[PDB]
Design a protein around this ligand. Structure first.
Ligand code: HEM
Ligand code: HEM
Lengths: 394, 394
């Protein structure tokens, strides 16, 4: 007597379990139990992952429905699960997306200056250094403050919400609501602050007083600030941290990208493809009975789209575990998802990683782990896989 | 085909696995594999744990021998495993032990003032608060700086070595040697610093220039500073952190100790007994063939004394899981070990915990976890079990 297979499989973000490939081959859609005790369908082939992400009848919004089978507990108000739908409905899609491109004047230069300052401090303090807490995360935090138009000194307090806000918990989290409410109040104050004129919040502050947006709520404007800060900072910090691990573990690649920095974009795209940063499949609730591979998923059932399932699928990406900078299908991975909820910050995420790596490779060409890789402590019950500390020497 | 039972069993420090009791009943000494691939004998009854700890032919010093089966990799020079033997041999035992009692003038008051300051800052910043990183560990760090006679501002840098120094690793750790050497150099500078006249280092500085100790090495004096700082700070911070979890999880006990603060010493003794802070059994190498229960341990074999094995043994501590403040044998636990290597800082450890709890209970009588207990992230491959963060509200 064995229990139903439980998800997630491993919080380790440095290697994929051999079990993923076995499952994809045997049962590319199959029943699993989530941390709440709910049943769900885990989808692990590129073909089936794409089918689900491209069929809106597998709804993100309806995962928030009272009484649904859940992957994990809500850490935001239920209506906030539909944030992107709400933005679109408010007429704000074009504005939000424009404010979060890496193309703003001075943005990339700020990013580079910031990376280089962070690295200089590490070099001045001497090895070992923690590349997550003292490089990747502060770089992500600095970036999002600039993107939002808010003071750099406000970033740390907002950042500290995230170890709780992006938990993957069986039960509601009291601290999540405390920090949510506090952070909403902060962003509402930002909208009332006359000195905030640049970035996303500067633009939202203007649109709020524009008669063309009079009936959009102050709640929605504040919510955009909190949601985009948290989602970008957690994604970019976590991705860059684990991409640095993949790089450090491949000294031939580290050396190449160091010698030929113009291959960094192709390197980063492959680091994206192999990245294990998402701790859980992407959740969707079926709004109809829908055939997916051999399974007829029924209305009301939860589906989990396993990104590394898709991204390591040999049918789509031959020699899936190898970093190859010349694949004929290099951006066709699902690291930023697909379909209606495709990542709105994908360009900014790419550029954060490219610039961080370029800067690290230049300042620390000798960068290597300062501890055996097995000594990394992987964060558990969290929506990302990340090492608590990333000790390096150089 | 099943592998040899692997140790340790769980890094979770908030509950004991049901497997411990099963094993103690079935096989209170039995063969296990450690993280290095070595075989060892795991001892889990109070009777057998005490027998081993009280028989010096089960040697701590000889665990450092080249070619021995290992629990984990050395994180200090091999000779430093015998630090307490070296102290005794140098004539320094009486002096070291006197400098680390809680009885120094002003010490307890410093401890209380420090706890109360740390708590006030948490209260001023508002819930949630992280009781490990922002209370228990800083309190431990402040305490040891005062005990050593070194500046409070030097504590943080020394503290930052510890996440690596107390790793339980299969392989040598490069960062461990970097920080060891740096920290030794710091303590040697302290011995040359005329302004350092109090505490352990003040006394060691005096004994170093005393003709009665002329042939004791500067290496030994510096080594005492590093070893006692790390061992005390890691032990007291880790213990207090996990004791606060046990307290928080028992609101009836929290309320009692709050109402009747004079039962705190009896409370702390029971929190000691049930504490799961030691991540691994205590390692000893057999220097002879010795009968232990049903097993004849052979010369050269590794033995691991599982403290929670002893401390939850129903034969010695009836209703072992219950905190009872009136047991007839309350200090007879093995939380501080037993025999030749009994903890030299036991009184100071007790007082750190008593004072921290007294202060927390007074300032935060409403203290509770701000996240579900399962959301705590347990540090892995470490010589202590600790949550990376302990989020509370009050
Ligand atoms: C390498 C960095 C990043 C990665 C790997 C990443 C990944 C993802 C993925 C897979 C999704 C889809 C979730 C789903 O379909 O259920 C997503 C959505 C999202 N991301 Fe990103 N992201 C990154 C950076 C960013 C940045 C820089 C921002 C904003 C500044 C951002 C903001 C968002 C938001 C608001 C959503 C929700 C989209 C929706 O519901 O329609 N992300 N991200
Ligand atoms: C609640 C707090 C503490 C606990 C639970 C604890 C526990 C222990 C235990 C079980 C041992 C025995 C290890 C063995 O036999 O292999 C030990 C040894 C030791 N402890 Fe503590 N300890 C605490 C606090 C402290 C403090 C405050 C200091 C110093 C200021 C300290 C310094 C040491 C040292 C130097 C040893 C090595 C003893 C030897 O090798 O002879 N500990 N501790």
């Amino acid at each position: 007597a064995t229990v139903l297979l439980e998800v997630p499989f491993s919080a380790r973000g440095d290697r994929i379990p051999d079990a993923v490939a076995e499952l994809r081959t045997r049962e590319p859609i199959r029943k699993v139990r989530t941390i709440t005790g709910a049943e769900a369908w885990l989808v692990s082939s590129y073909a089936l992952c794409t089918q689900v992400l491209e069929d809106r009848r597998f709804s993100m919004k309806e995962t928030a429905a009272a009484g649904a089978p859940r992957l994990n507990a809500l850490t935001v108000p239920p209506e906030v699960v539909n944030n992107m739908g709400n933005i679109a409905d408010a007429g704000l899609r074009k504005a939000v997306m424009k404010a979060i491109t890496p193309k703003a004047p001075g943005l990339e230069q700020f990013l580079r200056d910031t990376a280089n300052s962070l690295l200089d401090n590490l070099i001045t303090e001497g090895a070992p250094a923690d590349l997550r807490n003292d490089f990747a995360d502060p770089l992500a935090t600095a970036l999002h403050c600039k993107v939002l138009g808010i003071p750099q000194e406000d970033g740390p307090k907002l950042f500290r919400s995230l170890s709780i806000a992006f938990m993957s918990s069986a039960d509601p989290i009291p601290a999540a609501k405390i920090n949510w409410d506090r952070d909403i109040e902060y962003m509402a104050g930002i909208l009332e602050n006359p000195n905030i004129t640049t970035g996303l919040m500067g633009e939202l502050s203007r649109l709020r007083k524009d008669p063309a947006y009079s009936h959009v709520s102050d709640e929605l404007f504040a919510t955009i600030g909190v949601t985009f800060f948290g989602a970008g900072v957690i994604a970019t910090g976590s991705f860059l941290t684990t991409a640095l691990i993949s790089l450090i573990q491949r000294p031939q690649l580290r050396n190449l990208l160091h010698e030929k920095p113009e291959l960094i974009p192709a390197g980063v795209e492959e680091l994206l493809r192999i990245n294990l940063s998402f701790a859980d499949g992407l959740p969707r609730l079926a709004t109809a009975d829908i055939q997916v591979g051999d399974v007829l998923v029924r209305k009301g059932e939860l589906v989990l789209v396993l990104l590394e399932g898709a991204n390591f699928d040999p049918e789509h990406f031959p020699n899936p575990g190898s970093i190859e900078l010349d694949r004929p299908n290099p951006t066709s991975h699902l690291a930023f998802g697909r379909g209606q909820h495709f990542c709105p910050g994908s360009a900014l995420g790419r550029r954060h990683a490219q610039i961080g790596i370029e800067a690290l490779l230049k300042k620390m060409p000798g960068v290597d782990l300062a501890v055996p890789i097995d000594q990394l402590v992987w964060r558990t019950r969290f929506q990302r896989r990340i090492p608590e500390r990333l000790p390096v020497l150089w």
